[PDB]
Amino acid sequence: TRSTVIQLLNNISTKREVEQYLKYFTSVSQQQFAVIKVGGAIISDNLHELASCLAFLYHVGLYPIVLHGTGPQVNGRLEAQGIEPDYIDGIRITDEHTMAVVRKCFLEQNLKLVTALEQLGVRARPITSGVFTADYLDKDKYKLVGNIKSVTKEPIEASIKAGALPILTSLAETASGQMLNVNADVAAGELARVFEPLKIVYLNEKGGIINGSTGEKISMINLDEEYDDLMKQSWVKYGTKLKIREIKELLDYLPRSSSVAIINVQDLQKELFTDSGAGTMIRRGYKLVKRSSIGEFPSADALRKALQRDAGISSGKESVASYLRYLENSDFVSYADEPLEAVAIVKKDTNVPTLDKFVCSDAAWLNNVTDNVFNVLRRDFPALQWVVSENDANIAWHFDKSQGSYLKGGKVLFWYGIDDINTISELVENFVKSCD
Amino acid sequence: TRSTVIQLLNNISTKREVEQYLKYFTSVSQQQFAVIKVGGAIISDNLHELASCLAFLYHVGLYPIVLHGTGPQVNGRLEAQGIEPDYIDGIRITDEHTMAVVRKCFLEQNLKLVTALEQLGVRARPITSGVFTADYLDKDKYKLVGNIKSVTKEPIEASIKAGALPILTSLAETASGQMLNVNADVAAGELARVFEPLKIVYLNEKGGIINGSTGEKISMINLDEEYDDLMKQSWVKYGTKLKIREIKELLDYLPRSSSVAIINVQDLQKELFTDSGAGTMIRRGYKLVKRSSIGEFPSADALRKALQRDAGISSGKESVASYLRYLENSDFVSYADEPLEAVAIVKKDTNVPTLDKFVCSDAAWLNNVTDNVFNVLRRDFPALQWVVSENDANIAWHFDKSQGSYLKGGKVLFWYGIDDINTISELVENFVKSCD
Amino acid sequence: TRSTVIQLLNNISTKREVEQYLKYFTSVSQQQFAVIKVGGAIISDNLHELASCLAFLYHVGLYPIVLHGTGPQVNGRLEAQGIEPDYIDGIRITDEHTMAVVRKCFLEQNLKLVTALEQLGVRARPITSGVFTADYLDKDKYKLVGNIKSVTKEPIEASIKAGALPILTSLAETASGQMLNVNADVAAGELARVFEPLKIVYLNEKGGIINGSTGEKISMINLDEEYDDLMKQSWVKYGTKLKIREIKELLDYLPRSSSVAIINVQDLQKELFTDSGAGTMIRRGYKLVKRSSIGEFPSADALRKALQRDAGISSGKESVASYLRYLENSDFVSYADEPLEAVAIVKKDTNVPTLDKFVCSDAAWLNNVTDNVFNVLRRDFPALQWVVSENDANIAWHFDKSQGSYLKGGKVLFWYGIDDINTISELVENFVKSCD
Amino acid sequence: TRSTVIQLLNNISTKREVEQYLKYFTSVSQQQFAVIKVGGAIISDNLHELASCLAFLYHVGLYPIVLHGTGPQVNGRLEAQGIEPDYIDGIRITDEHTMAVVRKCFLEQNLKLVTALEQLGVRARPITSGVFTADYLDKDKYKLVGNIKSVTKEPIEASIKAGALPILTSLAETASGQMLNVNADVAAGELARVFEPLKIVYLNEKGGIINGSTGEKISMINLDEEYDDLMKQSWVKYGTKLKIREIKELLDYLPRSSSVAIINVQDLQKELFTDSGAGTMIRRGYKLVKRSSIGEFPSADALRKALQRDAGISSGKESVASYLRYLENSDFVSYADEPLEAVAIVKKDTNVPTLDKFVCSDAAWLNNVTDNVFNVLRRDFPALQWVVSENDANIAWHFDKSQGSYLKGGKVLFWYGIDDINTISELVENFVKSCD
C-alpha cells in the first residue's frame, strides 16, 4: 500500500539515495539481491524488528536469502541439561548429545522466524536441510562439525521463484545423510560465493566496527586500498582480523560490484542502500595508481579514450592530442584507477597546484571512486585549487570538498588548504584574468 | 470462483453424496482432513492430475497432509549407476552409497510436486526433514533404515496454519542427526495415528488390491474377519503383506470407523468424500460369527432384543417367540457380528436358500457392516434369494447386490447366482404364491 | 473460501437441485443469470436478508441484475411534506413536487442497497439513470409518468464485466433528459426481454400465488400445458390473469431454459434453484405429442437430430438413416415433446411391446419430462419391456418404473405389467439369446 | 507492488520533493486529496496516460475526485448529424435535440474512463447523476443549461469510502428531474468549494501559461503578491484574465494550504506534488512585507517567537532581548511574510550589508518562501554578505545563491555582487578576525 511508500521515503535522505534505490529495483536481477546472515541472538530477542524489516524488502519486491544461526539459547539448554559446552580452536566440539540439542534449537528458531514473517504477510519457506553438502572438519577434533563442500541452489531458487523468502539454517549434511554443525558465517560466505549477490549483510548485535584507538566508528573500508596497512595495525583486535580477512577472501572471488556490510539490526534498511548508515561497509574498490609521466600509463591510448569523456574536450576547445603534448612537457602527478574510470591530473607548477583534469565516469561517481581520489589528493597535496562548471551535476560536492569558492561567469573556482589573504587574492585574480 | 463450485457439483451424483460432502466441510476440523500417501511413481509420471486435484482440495479450503515416496526413479538411477537394488523383508537395504542417491531423489521429487502445486496457485511448503524422529531398524540388516520413534507435529501444523499444503518426504532422522530411509507407507501410517484424520488415502498405481487369483479387485476388506486367511493366500505377494499388516496395525489403534482407502489418483476427489470411489477400502469392522443353532448364540436373550428391531416383528405379524420356535426346528446358517448390530439368517431348506431375516441397524448401515455381511453370504451361498419392502430406505442397494428382481404388491423379490430360466420361474411362483 | 461451499451445500436438498445449480454455473453466460425485481418495501425493512442473499449469488459467481422500486416510504414522506398522494387509473399522478420527493427516495434507497452489499464485500454499482429511455405516458393525466421506449444495455454490461452487481432504479428519462416515474414490474420485464436471462424473479411481499377456491398454493405452472384451462377458470382473480398473461407473453419470446419466480424474500435463495421452495414458479415446459408415422413429425430432420443423441447410434452400430428406414416400415407409437428434448419410440410388434428408443436429454431428465413420458406409456401400454445399460446414470429410475429385472453381461432387462410366469421366462430367454 | 515504488522514485528529483511527497501521505487527510477536472479531449485521445496516472494515485492510497467533460467528440457528432453547433456568450445553446446527443456522449465517455481504470485494477464508480442540483441559467438564452445551486456529497463520499474512484459527469439536474448541461470548469470549482481539497487540477491539452511578451512560461503565480500588478498588465490576454480571476476567486474561499494547477496531462503526477513540474501552478501564498523598525511589525511579540527558532539564540549566545535592543538602534531592512514563517534581517551599516538573521521555518523552506525572500534581497541589495553553519541542513542552497564562499572553523562566509578583489579580501579578513 502506502505503508510501504511511507517507509521507503522515511529512509531517503538525499538525491543520491533515490538514484541508489532505483538501481536495485530497475536492475533485471537474475543477479540476486542479498544474502543476510542473522545471528541466533536476534531471532530469540529482537525478532519483531528483523521481521518487520525483511517484510519491507519482500513488499518492495526484493527477495533476500536469509541464513540464521542459533547461538546463546543453545548454550543455556546444554547447561540446563548438565553439559558444560566445549570450544576448541573457536569452534564447538559437537558430539551426538550436543548435536541433538543444536538441531532442535535450529528448527525451533528457524520456524519461529518463518511463522513470524508469515504473520506479517510475507511468504516464508523454511529450508532446514539440503542446501549445504559437507564433510567432517576433523572428526577427532570437532566430532560432528562440517566443512562445506558445496551449495545446491535448487531449493533457494525454486523458493524465490515461487515467491517466498527462503530462510536457511546453517546445517550442512554429508552424502550419506549425517547432519553437521557449521559456522553461520562461513555458511553465509559460501552462499555469497555461489549466488554472487549485490549485498552481503552480516547482522551482528554489536554494530559495525569501532576503532579501539581513536574511538571513532568505521563507515567504509576500501580493501584494495586500506586492507594491508589497516590489518597490520596494533589497535585492530584479533577477532576483527579473523573477520576482516574472512571478508577480504570472500570479495576477492566475487565481482567488484559486490559489497559487504556489518550492521546492527535497527539500522538495516538504511545501509542496504546507503553508505551513510552507521555500521561498517566493506568492499574491494579501486587501487588508484599514481603516475608522473604519459609513457608510464600502460594504456598509451585508453588515457585518451578516458579524457574524451570530459565536456570541455568533447565540446572542442582543445583536443586531447593538443592537451597530451602540453602534459608530457609538464611535471604533473596523475592518480587514476586501473580501468581509467576516473583520472585526476594535478599540474604541480603553480603554487596552489591546479587539478587540471578530473575526468570521472558516471559509474565512478555512484561508486564514490571520486570521493577516494580526493582523499588521496588531500594528503598528497595539502593545498590545492580547481575549476568546475557552474552547473556541473555535482557541484554541491565540490563545494563540500573546498574551503573557498569564487564564481566568474560560467566557471567556479575552488580551493583548499590556503589562507594567506594575499595568496587567495592571487588565486582569484589569475582566475578572473583567465578570461582570454 | 465458480471454477471450484462446478467441479464439486460435477462430482455429486445422488443425495447421499451431498450429505457426505457436508459432513467433511461442516466438521470444525481441528481434527485434520486427510493424510494422502503418494507413491513416487505418481510424481514422476502422473503429476498434473495429482496437482490439479490437490489444488481443488486447497481451493475448497481443505488442507490435505501429503506424504510422498520415491520408488522407481531411484531404482533406475541405482541401476544406471550399476547397483542391483536390495530388498530384505520388504525394506531396502540402504548403505551410505544408496542413501545419498535416495536422499537426492527425495528432494528432487519433493520439490517437483511443490513447484507443481505452486504453479497451479497452491501454496506448498516442502518439509524435507524434521517431522519424523527415528532410530535404526536393525543396523546390521537394513543399515540406515529407521523405525519411527515419534512424529513432531509442529511444522505440519504451523504450515497448514500459515496456509500452505505440507508436502512431506518420508525421511526420519535420529537424535544425533543421521537421516534414515523409512517406507512411505509406514511413515503414512505413523502420521495417521498422530493426526487422527477424517480420511486416509493410499494412492497406488494399479487402483486398489487386485486379486491375483480371481483377477479383479477386493472392494472392502474387513480386517477383523478376513485378515488372516486373506493374507495367507498363495496369490498375495510380500510387498502387499508389508502394506496389509502395516494397515491392520494402524487401524487396530484407531477407532472402529477410521478407515483406509486404496485408490488410483484419477479418482481421488471422489473418494475423499463419497464411497462411490470403488477400490480397496480397508477397515477393522466386525468379526461376523457363523452360527447353526439357537443355543449356540452366547446371548439367549439379546438375539431376541436384536430381531425386535425388524419392522415386521415390531409391527406384530409374528412375535419373536413364535419365530424362534420355527428357527430352532430348521437348518439355518446365521451370521451375526459380536454385538448383534447386524443379524442375517439364511434358511437353507429351499434350493435357492432364503435370507429370511437381515436385521441391520441404522448404525450398521452407515458403517457398511451390511456390505460385509453380504460379502460373507456371497462366498458361503453362491446362489441366494431374499425379499425387501418396496420402499426400504436402501432398496437401491439390494438391487445392486442382485442379478434379478420381481415385484408383487408391496414386496420385492431378489436373487443372485441363478439362471436356469425354469428355476427362476420356480422362485417367482413360490414368491407370488406366498400371498396367504 | 469454504464459507461459500458450505452455504451452497446447505441449500441443496436433492439430486435434481444439484443438476439445476450446475446449469446456471456451467452456463457460459453471455446469456445472463437473472433479472431480480425488488419492491421498495424490502430495502427499507428487510434489507439484511436481501443483501445476505445477493451476496451469496455474487460469491458463488452469479451476477444478478437488481432492479428496485420505492413504494411505502415515498407515501409517508409525501404525507410528512403535506401532499395527499394521488392515484388516477391505478397510477400515481406525479407532478414536479411529487417527482422531487420520489427521486430523492429512489437515490437514497438505491445507494442504501449498494452500501449494504458493499459492506458484505460485494461490489455494487449504483445505476441511477440512463438504462431506461422513455416518453410521457400521458402528460395531462399522469404528468411526469413515463412509458419505456427502450433499454440501453451498455452500463449494465460494463458493470457485470468489471465485476459488480448492477443496482438499477426504475426511473426512465426522456431524450431531452426529464426523468419520469415508471412501473418497477414493467421495467423488470423490459430488461428481461433484452438480456434474455435464465431466471426472472419478482420479489413480492405477498409470497407467490394461492388458489382462491381450494386454498392450496401453486408451486409451478407449466404454461404450454396448463395456461389455457388455468386461465379460463372461474376462481382465478383478474389481477392474477393480468399477471399470468403478462408472464406467458414474456417467456413466449425467451428461451425454454428461462423461468419466472414469484417469491417472498425470505424463501429466495432456495427457489432460485429448486422448485420445492414455496412461492410460485412459472415456465413454458412441455406437451408430449403422440405420433404414429415418421412423416407425422413436423420436423422431418430434427427427429434425426434427436435420435443422434442416443449412445448406440452415436457410437455407430446403426446409423440413423438405416434406423429410420426400419421405423417407417413398422407400427410404432412415439411420444415426444414439442422441441424433441425427449423421444420415446415403442415398437408394438412383439407381445410385450419394446421401448426401442428412449432418447432423453440431460435437460429433459432434470425437468422430469422423462417421468411424464413414462406415465403416458403406462396407460397407453399396460405391459411393456425395455433394456438399459448396467451403469446408465439413472438406472435406479428404471428399476423404480419396473415390476421385474434381469441382468445379463452389461445390459439390464426391465418390464412391467406382466406376470404369466411363462411369458416372463419368454422375455428372459429372448433377451439372454439377444447376445447375437 | 514495486510498480508503484518505481513510479514514485522516477518522479522524485531532489530532497525537497521527498519531503513534499511525505507531507501528502503523512497528512491524516479527512481533508481530501484532489479534484481533477478532465477535458473531454483527453478521454477520447490520450486515455492510457490519464488512467495510468489516476491508477497511481489510487494505488498509493489517494482518492482523486475526477470530473470530466465531453467537448470535441460532441461537436463532431452534431456535425455528422448535420447540426451546426451553437455558442452564445461562450456557452452551448442546448435544446432537447442537442441535449440528447450531449448526454449520450457524456455517458459513453464516462463509462470509457471507468472501464479503462477498471482494467488497470482500479475500482471506479460512474456517477452520471445526482451530485449536482441546479436550475436553468436562462431558459430563453441557453435552453437546458443549468446554474449549479448545490453539490450533494453523499455519493462521492460513499464511493471513496467503499474504495472506488468517483468519476463524475458534469450534468446537474433540477428538483423536478430535468438534466441540464453545465460547464465542466464551473462544476469542478463547485466541487472544490465543497470538499476543500488540497490540490485542484485543471487538465488542459494546451499546457499551462506562456508569457506572450517575454516568451517565458509561468511556473507559479503567488496571487496575494502578484495578482494585482500581473492582472493590470498589457501582455496578459483576456482569455488568461478571465481564468486568472476565476482561480483567484476560487482560492479566496479555500484554505491557504489549497492550490490550483493547470497542466498538460503528461506532466500530471509530477506537479501533483512538486512545483518544478512544467505547467502553471497558482495559489494565494505569502506577501513579504518590508519593515524598517521593530515597532513596525504588527506582532510586537511573535517577532520574538520567530527569532527564537534560530539555533544561535536557542543555544544561548545572545538572547533575543539583547539582540532586539541592538536592532532597534540600527538601520536595518527586514523582509518577512505575513505569518512570520520566514524573517530576514539585513544590517545595512557595513558596505557589503550583512544578512544578520535569516530565520526560516521548516515549512517556509518546503514552501520556498526562503527562495522568494532572497529574490527580494537580490534587487533591493545588489551586493550582500552572510554567514551559515558548515552543516546547516541546506548549505547547498546558500552556496547556490552566492558568488563567493570562505570557510573558517565551523562557519561559512557567503557573498554576492562584489568583485573588487581587494574588497573581497576585506570581507574574508573581517570574517576570519571575527573569531573572538
Author numbering:
A (entry chain C), B (entry chain D), C (entry chain A), D (entry chain B): 67 to 502
Publication text:
The structure of the mature yNAGK, lacking the N-terminal mitochondrial targeting sequence (residues 1–57), reveals an unexpected novel tetrameric architecture, which can be described as a dimer of dimers with D2 symmetry.
The structures of the four tetramers found in the two crystals deviate from perfect D2 molecular symmetry, with three subunits in each tetramer exhibiting the open AAK domain conformation. The degree of AAK domain opening is even higher than in the arginine-containing subunit of the truncated enzyme, corresponding to a 20° rotation of the C-lobe. The pulling of the C-lobes by the paired DUF619 domains possibly contributes to this opening of the AAK domain, which is associated with rotations of up to 55° of the DUF619 domain around a hinge located at the AAK domain-DUF619 domain linker (351GYK). The DUF619 domain is a bilobar (N-moiety, residues 354–447; C-moiety, residues 448–502) open αβα sandwich nucleated by a 7-stranded antiparallel β-sheet, which has the characteristic architecture of the histone acetyltransferase fold (GNAT fold). The pairing of the DUF619 domains on each side of the yNAGK tetramer involves hydrophobic interactions between the E′ and F′ helices as well as the continuity of the central β sheets by way of antiparallel bonding of strands 6′ from both domains. These interactions are maintained in the four pairs of DUF619 domains observed in the present crystal structure (with r.m.s.d.s from 0.85 to 1.45 Å), despite the important departures from the D2 symmetry observed in the yNAGK tetramers.
